Nucleic acid binder design. Structure first.
Ligand SMILES: [Mg+2]
Ligand SMILES: [Mg+2]
Ligand SMILES: [Mg+2]
Ligand SMILES: [Mg+2]
Ligand SMILES: [Mg+2]
Ligand SMILES: [Mg+2]
Ligand SMILES: [Mg+2]
Ligand SMILES: [Mg+2]
Ligand SMILES: [Mg+2]
Ligand SMILES: [Mg+2]
Ligand SMILES: [Mg+2]
Ligand SMILES: [Mg+2]
Ligand SMILES: [Mg+2]
Ligand SMILES: [Mg+2]
Ligand SMILES: [Mg+2]
Ligand SMILES: [Mg+2]
Ligand SMILES: [Mg+2]
Ligand SMILES: [Mg+2]
Ligand SMILES: [Mg+2]
Ligand SMILES: [Mg+2]
Ligand SMILES: [Mg+2]
Ligand SMILES: [Mg+2]
Ligand SMILES: [Mg+2]
Ligand SMILES: [Mg+2]
Ligand SMILES: [Mg+2]
Ligand SMILES: [Mg+2]
Ligand SMILES: [Mg+2]
Ligand SMILES: [Mg+2]
Ligand SMILES: [Mg+2]
Ligand SMILES: [Mg+2]
Ligand SMILES: [Mg+2]
Ligand SMILES: [Mg+2]
Ligand SMILES: [Mg+2]
Ligand SMILES: [Mg+2]
Ligand SMILES: [Mg+2]
Ligand SMILES: [Mg+2]
Ligand SMILES: [Mg+2]
Ligand SMILES: [Mg+2]
Ligand SMILES: [Mg+2]
Ligand SMILES: [Mg+2]
Ligand SMILES: [Mg+2]
Ligand SMILES: [Mg+2]
Ligand SMILES: [Mg+2]
Ligand SMILES: [Mg+2]
Ligand SMILES: [Mg+2]
Ligand SMILES: [Mg+2]
Ligand SMILES: [Mg+2]
Ligand SMILES: [Mg+2]
Ligand SMILES: [Mg+2]
Ligand SMILES: [Mg+2]
Ligand SMILES: [Mg+2]
Ligand SMILES: [Mg+2]
Ligand SMILES: [Mg+2]
Ligand SMILES: [Mg+2]
Ligand SMILES: [Mg+2]
Ligand SMILES: [Mg+2]
Lengths: 129, 151, 144
RNA sequence: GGAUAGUGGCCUACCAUGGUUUCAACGGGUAACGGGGAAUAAGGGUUCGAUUCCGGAGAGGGAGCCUGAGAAACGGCUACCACAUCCAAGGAAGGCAGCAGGCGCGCAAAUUACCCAAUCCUAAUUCAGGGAGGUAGUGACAAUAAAUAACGAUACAGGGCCCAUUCGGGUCUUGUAAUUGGAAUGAGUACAAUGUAAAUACCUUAACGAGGAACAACUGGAGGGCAAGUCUGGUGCCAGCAGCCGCGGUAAUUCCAGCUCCAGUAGCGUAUAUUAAAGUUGUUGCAGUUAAAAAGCUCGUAGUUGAACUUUGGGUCUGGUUGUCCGGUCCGACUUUAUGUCGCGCACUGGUUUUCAACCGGAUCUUUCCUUCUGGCUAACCUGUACUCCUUGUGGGUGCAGGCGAACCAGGACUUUUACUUUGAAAAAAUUAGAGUGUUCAAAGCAGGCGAAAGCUCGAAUAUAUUAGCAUGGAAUAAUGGAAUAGGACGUUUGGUUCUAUUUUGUUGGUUUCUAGGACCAUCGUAAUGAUUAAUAGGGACGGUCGGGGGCAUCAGUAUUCAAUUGUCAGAGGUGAAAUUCUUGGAUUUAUUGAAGACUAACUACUGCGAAAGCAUUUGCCAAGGACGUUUUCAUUAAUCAAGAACGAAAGUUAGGGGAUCGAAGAUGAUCAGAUACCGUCGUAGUCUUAACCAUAAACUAUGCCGACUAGGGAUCGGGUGGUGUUUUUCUUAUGACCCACUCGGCACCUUACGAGAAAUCAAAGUCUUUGGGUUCUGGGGGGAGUAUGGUCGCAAGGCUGAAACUUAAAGGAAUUG
RNA sequence: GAAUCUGGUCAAACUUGGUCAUUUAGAGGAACUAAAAGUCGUAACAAGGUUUCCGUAGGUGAACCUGCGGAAGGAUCAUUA
RNA sequence: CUCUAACUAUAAAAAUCUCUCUUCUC
């Protein structure tokens, strides 16, 4: 049973990147996947994706440009207080100069730097760098 | 590809066409289709056989495309929906058949295990239909009382 | 993914799983069962006095051929009897029979050390005076 | 009802039979007082917290009580129990877990000292009292700073050297020598004075106080881990050393010493406990094919987890914060000064619509609502009434009835409910963090600083606590709820109902009004009147199938062993070789047959079915099942699963049936040194069954299940699609059987690493330090040991659950060379 | 208004058995370790000289042997010869 | 660029073994 759909999407992205491809076909295509890929676009780790209406949860075709090296979900969307954001960034991101802990706040799904700018924090979705 | 109660992994199914609206070539009327559905139900047919008949002998791709309502929903609007939902009824029919086969020959252990599987499935479906209040909250499946519902 | 559950509401089984697995260790099992108080010659005690019953020497293992000079001591705190080791070269004669001797641990967590079999305790003091002070002739046995 | 100060099964009387529990109740253990906190420290945590503060409890264990506001008090009484004291034997008096001190205990812990100076407290109250407390005594528990020498002048030396005639001055310095000099200083004593309630002690300081400055620094170690010796002597697998590996058997770098050296140093060594190391507890963050470890398999309650979908956009205005360009302001190069100058490209403060670019907001328009009214209060001008102060100018107003309410009140009204997260109030001080501050530095402390010396002063900062509660902004993520019988939402609808009661007719009692205020009830209309998809999730219907899936009943086959008839005639079995055994009552073979029971050869394969065991002659019946096809149906019904359950090879156990073969035990004949083992001949139980037990296997793919993705190559099984395909023959065609292509599902297989592993190897054992899809079970060195005990199941066999004491430095995995 | 005294009430504690828990001896029995220069065999590691191992049952100085099912951790990944 | 044929056939017996292990630095 597909429990965490975003996990499947990011796993497909990782597999299709490690093999060097430039495209992925993510099947279930929820809101959260769309927002995750939109954040990745805003920061450039992804290219030009596409939603394919099925009337059936839709699908997504993702274009890459090799700039990304790893996605990944934190499957238990831990409640992250504004104090623990730095802890997650240290534990997940490889360096302080880049990388982004994509986390879901009451103000939408945002990268950790943007959430720290709004001075709001919520649950953690995943990480990209 | 789950096959809840076995090791199967098949995905044999049907792909509903993208267009929800009526097919261009269909000339029948929605009111006539609903009348046909009502007549078939009055003949004593479950919704699945009604859909099969409308797909084979007539141009009805599916009721929801043509009318806008589902077959069981259409029957319920006219008050012909059976007191026991069709899939659960067929499960009880199968269970009573296997129990008959068992009580007519004891040593068959494989059919005993299959009866256990069927009863587990019956319990699951009954729990679902009970949490949606289709069945009364006192409704339960019992081995002795299943025959009366089947018969 | 892994054997352990990962859901946000699975704290209970994670905690009880860790609590059931902790018994696999030896230190935790000893600490919680409290076997030190009930079974060991000393109950959580670094040192203990005792009375010398007799004056024995015990042979070593295969790779080491010698006879290590031990002493059988009955503990005064509870009455148990244990063999103990007189450490240095000419200290066997220093400790006489039926004198109070303060045994200590042997440094290997209550297990036999080196090539000496069936011993787990040193000898630090005899008749109130320490063996190291006697061995370098800094003090002398009171002989009471 | 009693009692209580008061609520309260707190107690009584009568009723009801209830309350907690797999979210662990109840019971057992705690060498458990709870907490503030301590150690430890990347982060997460682990252990400790008897004790300087806050609570609680206790005064030998128990009960009972007077006095008071407050006690179930114990430096208050009564009694029992335990332990005791004086005794003139009649009696009397006891409570150190207060300060001292003693006995005992144990490895383990202080002087019967001074005093109310300081903090305070009690009292009639300054004055009295206070073993509270402070001061000293002991005190290497811990903690801070820090002496044990420093500098010359000489002899023995070494490096930068002027070059290099050998030199060599030592030209330039740095060490080594029992040589040799002059200084400085305490650690100690001690006039004093300060200190203190009085005294020590410290701070200061007379007078003494260093030459081997004997005023003498130890504790461990010198094979490795781990800095430092293969120097000397001694002992020779002794004595002993060694945390582990190891040294010691006549040349010991390891034992005992001497010499030298190393580490820390007034401290160092040991013991136990504990923390980091321990990614060896793994939530972050462990492993399960073989190293320990996937329940034999399946179902299943609780638990955990659970598909997608319900406003996304835009345009404007506008507020802070940035970097912008420069304004004023000005400062660095020019030095006793600056500007003119060289610009750091402005050290303070603005235009910041200079386009810029954000980084946050706020209001506005969407069929785009933010709870709305009901009176306040109308705050405010869409009010227009009297009108215009002033340049004829909507810049600007004195202002009264409508009328803007988020600019705000205070009231009825409805509030889907959470989880989550931001901010704030709260989380006692001490402690941790941390600001200021020359305690001589520091541990500390909360002090101090500055005047001219003539009173003037800044302090005693902050943060964190991650749980529970309260308020608050947000509405993604996660969950629940609406309207399906409409009993749904709205309205000036139009009707009826119990009422309720302000005022009003004085007040009081009712009768109706009227007005206004909730609904119960019909009817009338307004409305876009109201049901998300149908997961390459699941269940179910249907279709033709497919299968050595299962049950019952039948059918056959040769074979085996016996038996009948017949045939001849010395051997036949068996073996490495023999023997035991059967045979002229004619065995072994030879032909027909007959009986019994078992079983299903060859077909039989890197083939099929099943949940796993397992399943292989034919036919019928019984029901079941996977896979495929499906523009069929329901719409989350699902995944994994403690508790519970169904099957579970062989062997084994009760009975009844059979009884061929083969064969545990047994009987023998051989082989041997022995052979009650392997070879051989007989041979009970068993093997075969109908009921009832058993629940274990190397129950193995030693690989849990569900889900997604990642790489090339062929084949094979079941299904389905297409071929202008080929033989088929029933003239043509329809099938069937092949051939080609594709697809779904299954047991599988070859190549490869570009991934993973300790590798053997794996297309999963991959997508794991770039560590998180859901979930169950198991392992923490080996042995003891899957043993004992206690449960529980079983008739029994035995199954499930399942340690410790103790012992050990390895056991073990894969591979390489021999 | 004292002694005394009626009924309760809180109830310590005593006697008597019962029960459980912890210590506590205890004839005797079955073990397990370490110590390896005793004795009888030589099971296993090679085809361990009967391949090995597992479950179960029987037997026997002893390791072990045998029977029935498995398994390769086998000594075969292989018969379209 | 066309292709499925040849072949057999050995198992007698064999138990056990007292030392001792030694440094790599240019
Ligand atoms: Mg505590
Ligand atoms: Mg206690
Ligand atoms: Mg405490
Ligand atoms: Mg205590
Ligand atoms: Mg206290
Ligand atoms: Mg008290
Ligand atoms: Mg006492
Ligand atoms: Mg008073
Ligand atoms: Mg008392
Ligand atoms: Mg007292
Ligand atoms: Mg008191
Ligand atoms: Mg008194
Ligand atoms: Mg005392
Ligand atoms: Mg005191
Ligand atoms: Mg002490
Ligand atoms: Mg002293
Ligand atoms: Mg000295
Ligand atoms: Mg020394
Ligand atoms: Mg030494
Ligand atoms: Mg030495
Ligand atoms: Mg070294
Ligand atoms: Mg020597
Ligand atoms: Mg491990
Ligand atoms: Mg093994
Ligand atoms: Mg293993
Ligand atoms: Mg398994
Ligand atoms: Mg459940
Ligand atoms: Mg979801
Ligand atoms: Mg505090
Ligand atoms: Mg501090
Ligand atoms: Mg009215
Ligand atoms: Mg579907
Ligand atoms: Mg076919
Ligand atoms: Mg026979
Ligand atoms: Mg004959
Ligand atoms: Mg056959
Ligand atoms: Mg087949
Ligand atoms: Mg279970
Ligand atoms: Mg049997
Ligand atoms: Mg029988
Ligand atoms: Mg025999
Ligand atoms: Mg014999
Ligand atoms: Mg035999
Ligand atoms: Mg026989
Ligand atoms: Mg087992
Ligand atoms: Mg297993
Ligand atoms: Mg172990
Ligand atoms: Mg074991
Ligand atoms: Mg038992
Ligand atoms: Mg090996
Ligand atoms: Mg009385
Ligand atoms: Mg022998
Ligand atoms: Mg052998
Ligand atoms: Mg063998
Ligand atoms: Mg042999
Ligand atoms: Mg043999």
């Amino acid at each position: 049973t597909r429990t965490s759909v975003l996990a499947d999407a990011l796993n497909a992205i990782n597999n299709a990147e490690k093999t060097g491809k430039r495209q992925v076909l993510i099947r279930p295509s929820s809101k959260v996947i769309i927002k995750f890929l939109q954040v990745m676009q805003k920061h450039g780790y992804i290219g030009e994706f596409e939603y394919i209406d099925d009337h059936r949860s839709g699908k997504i075709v993702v274009q890459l440009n090799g700039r990304l090296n790893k996605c990944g979900v934190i499957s238990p969307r831990f409640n992250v207080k504004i104090a623990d954001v730095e802890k997650w960034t240290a534990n997940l991101l490889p360096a302080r100069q880049f990388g982004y802990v994509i986390l879901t706040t009451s103000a939408g799904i945002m990268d950790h730097e943007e959430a720290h700018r709004k001075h709001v924090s919520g649950k953690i979705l995943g990480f990209v760098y | 590809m789950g096959r809840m109660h076995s090791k199967g992994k098949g995905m044999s199914s049907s792909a509903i066409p993208y267009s929800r609206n009526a097919p261009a070539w269909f000339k029948g009327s929605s009111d006539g289709v609903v009348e046909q559905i009502i007549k078939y139900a009055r003949k004593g047919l479950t919704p699945s056989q009604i859909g099969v008949l409308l797909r084979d002998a007539h141009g009805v791709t599916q009721a929801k495309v043509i009318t806008g309502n589902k077959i069981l929903r259409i029957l319920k609007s006219n008050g012909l929906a059976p007191e026991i939902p069709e899939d659960l009824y067929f499960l009880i029919k199968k269970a009573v058949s296997v129990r008959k086969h068992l009580e007519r020959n004891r040593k068959d252990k494989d059919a005993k295990f299959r009866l256990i599987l069927i009863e587990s499935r019956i319990h699951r479906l009954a729990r679902y239909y009970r949490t949606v209040s289709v069945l009364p909250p006192n409704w339960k499946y019992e081995s002795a009382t299943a025959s009366a519902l089947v018969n | 993914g892994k054997g352990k559950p990962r859901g946000l509401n699975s704290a209970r089984k994670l905690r009880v799983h860790r609590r059931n697995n902790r018994w696999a260790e030896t230190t935790y099992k000893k600490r919680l069962l409290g076997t030190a108080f009930k079974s060991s010659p000393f109950g959580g005690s670094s040192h203990a006095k005792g009375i010398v019953l007799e004056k024995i020497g015990i042979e070593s293992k295969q790779p080491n051929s010698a006879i290590r000079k031990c002493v059988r001591v009955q503990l005064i705190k509870n009455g148990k009897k244990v063999t103990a080791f007189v450490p240095n070269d000419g200290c066997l004669n220093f400790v006489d029979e039926n004198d109070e001797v303060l045994l200590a641990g042997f440094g290997r967590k209550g297990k036999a050390k080196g090539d000496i079999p069936g011993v787990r305790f040193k000898v630090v003091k005899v008749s109130g005076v320490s063996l190291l002070a006697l061995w370098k002739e800094k003090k002398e046995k009171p002989r009471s």
